[PDB]
Amino acid sequence: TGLFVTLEGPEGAGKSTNRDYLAERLRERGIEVQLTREPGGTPLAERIRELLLAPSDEPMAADTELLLMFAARAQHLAGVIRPALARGAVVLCDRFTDATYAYQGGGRGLPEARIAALESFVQGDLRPDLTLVFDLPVRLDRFEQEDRRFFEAVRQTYLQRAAQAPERYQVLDAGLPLAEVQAGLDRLLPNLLERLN
Amino acid sequence: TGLFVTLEGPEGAGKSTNRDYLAERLRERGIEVQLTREPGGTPLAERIRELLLAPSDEPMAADTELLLMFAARAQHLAGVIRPALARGAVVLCDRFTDATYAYQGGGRGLPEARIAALESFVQGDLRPDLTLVFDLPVEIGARGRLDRFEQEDRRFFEAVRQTYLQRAAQAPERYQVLDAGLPLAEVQAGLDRLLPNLLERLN
Ligand SMILES: Cc1cn([C@H]2C[C@H](N=[N+]=[N-])[C@@H](COP(=O)(O)O)O2)c(=O)[nH]c1=O
Ligand SMILES: Cc1cn([C@H]2C[C@H](N=[N+]=[N-])[C@@H](COP(=O)(O)O)O2)c(=O)[nH]c1=O
Ligand SMILES: [Cl-]
Ligand SMILES: [Cl-]
Ligand SMILES: [Cl-]
């Protein structure tokens, strides 16, 4: 049995360096670590990501964007995430369904219930064991074209979701000195290892 | 007030030769016709189509394939189908959700209940007003499809064929089954025969 950990938050929050940090802590304890990201994580998922990010003169329907995001997820689950967990590996996934509630839900305004329906439809009972929210104040692809209010509603959705399920989430103040943040990651580790074992 | 007509069946069933005939019967009667096809029908929906058709060493999960089909459908609905019906055009759409039940359901073995939930999720209350099923026994009659579906065996395609006939029989009011194996004159007669009912559905 393995463990499914997701990381959510914007760039410049240190997600990658901190994911590397966590990954080294686990690896030095003999635990296999599978790094991955969404949307993407397999050849086909990465091609779907390309459609998602590529600007176009044709407006992408909201449902189209939502269904593509979940198509990439479906493929990623089958190709990478589930097999990793089956190996007893710890998956460190940069962005997952919380990013859907945040971007397609908070950002775009899609009803949370439609996102919930697809989450269950695609994932069955699988949810992350732990979700690390890297929180900090707020050419381009389709999403980077968006405005400050979009990214503000994005930020707030992570915190709202994190607040409703405090046991599954750990919110990190990415505005804190890196050293302090990684100290937080160290304090999370025992519980992580306990979960895994 | 338009009419949403879909055409189902494999390649070499005459769907296109038949669609052109049907489209002209409508046009000569002063009726606007919108030709389209799935997966695809808009630039983004065609990009999705090409992903679905592209061979790869990585197997596409059945759910991935189902979701991409519906993603293309949602874009196509918004950009072509709903507008056309709104203008009061007759949409003649090559392939639609019946192909999903047939390919993803019958072929891939996905449960009909899962397909139905997506159908509703994406389409709301919109379903075809009339579906023409061009029924053809599995007939290989040069390089093949040249796409992902080329690799599937006869059993897969038998299941596809049978799914169409089962759906048509379950709701005879909405489907017309044509024998696409007939000489083209006789298929045209089939089109001629169903035309008056199609017209009555429009007004
Ligand atoms: C996984 C996921 C990502 N996204 C967005 C977040 C990102 N847009 N920004 N900023 C983009 C991912 O690109 P990056 O991983 O390079 O950040 O896709 C969603 O909108 N929904 C999702 O479910
Ligand atoms: C519309 C639709 C098509 N398809 C398949 C049927 C076809 N493969 N074969 N034979 C392919 C459509 O391409 P053609 O119409 O050019 O044949 O996509 C689906 O699997 N699901 C769908 O929902
Ligand atoms: Cl973010
Ligand atoms: Cl990654
Ligand atoms: Cl067409």
Residue with tokens 């901190």: A18
In whole angstroms, give the CA distance from residue A69 to residue B4: 29
Chain A positions with Cβ closer than 8 Å to B: 42-44, 47-48, 51, 56, 58, 60-61, 63-64, 67-68, 70-71, 74-75, 77-79, 114, 117-118, 121-122
| CB burial of residue B113 (10 Å; 0-12, 13-18, 19+) | exposed
| Distant-in-sequence, close-in-space partners of A138: CB < 8 Å, separation ≥ 6 | A10, A148, A151, A152, A155
If you measure CA to CA, which chain B residue comes closest to A61? B75
Of residues A58, A71, A117, nearest to B44 (C-beta): A58
The SS3 assignment for B194 reads helix
Task: For the sheet with A90-94, list strands across it.
Answer: A33-37, A90-94, A3-8, A130-135, A169-173
The SS3 assignment for A33 reads strand
Please answer whether residues B132 and B176 qualify as being in contact, where contact means their C-beta atoms are separated by less than 8 angstroms.
yes
Residue with tokens 């399920």: A165
* Token pair belonging to A35: 């790094």
Q: What is the dihedral of CA B44, B47, B48, B52, to 10 degrees?
A: 170
User: Is residue A38 in contact with ligand 1, taking CB distance under 6 Å?
Assistant: yes
Helix A43-53 × helix B43-53 angle, to 10°:
180
* Token pair belonging to A74: 């479906």
Q: Where are the beta strands (DSSP E) in A24-176?
A: 33-37, 90-94, 130-135, 169-173
The SS3 assignment for B29 reads coil
In whole angstroms, give the CA distance from residue A161 to residue A164: 5
Question: Cis omega before residue A43 (within 30°)?
Answer: no
The SS3 assignment for A169 reads strand
CB atoms within 10 A of CB B133: 23
In whole angstroms, give the CA distance from residue A44 to residue A144: 23
CA distances from B32 to A167, B24, B37, B126, B203 (A): 59, 10, 17, 20, 14
Q: How far is the CA of B45 from the centre of ligand 5 (A)?
A: 12
| Nearest protein Cα to ligand 2, atom 3 | B99
Range of the domain at B140: 1-203
In whole angstroms, give the CA distance from residue B85 to residue B82: 5
Amino acid of residue A50: E
CB contact under 8 A, A114 and B121: yes
User: Is residue B38 in contact with ligand 2, taking CB distance under 6 Å?
Assistant: yes
Q: What is the dihedral of CA B8, B9, B14, B20, to 10 degrees?
A: 10
Q: How far is the CA of B103 from the centre of ligand 2 (A)?
A: 7
Of residues B47, B64, B74, nearest to A61 (C-beta): B74
CA distances from B183 to B13, B14, B20, B136 (A): 11, 10, 17, 12
Question: Cis omega before residue B10 (within 30°)?
Answer: no
In whole angstroms, give the CA distance from residue B166 to residue B159: 10
- The closest of B74, B10, B68, B6 to B42, measured between CA atoms, is B74
| CB burial of residue B104 (10 Å; 0-12, 13-18, 19+) | buried
Please tell me the distance in Å from B192's CA to the nearest CA on chain A.
37
Please answer whether residues B6 and B133 qualify as being in contact, where contact means their C-beta atoms are separated by less than 8 angstroms.
no
CB atoms within 10 A of CB A167: 6
- The closest of A31, A9, A1, A7 to A185, measured between CA atoms, is A7
Which of B80, B103, B136 has the most ligand 2 atoms within 8 A of CB, as the residue to mutate?
A: B103
Helix A62-76 × helix A43-53 angle, to 10°:
160
CB contact under 8 A, A71 and B67: yes
- The closest of A80, A73, A153, B120 to A65, measured between CA atoms, is A73
CB atoms within 10 A of CB A193: 15
CATH code assigned at A162 = 3.40.50.300
Phi/psi at A3 (5° precision): -145, 140
The tally of domains found in chain B comes to 1
In whole angstroms, give the CA distance from residue B69 to residue A63: 12
In whole angstroms, give the CA distance from residue A38 to residue A116: 18
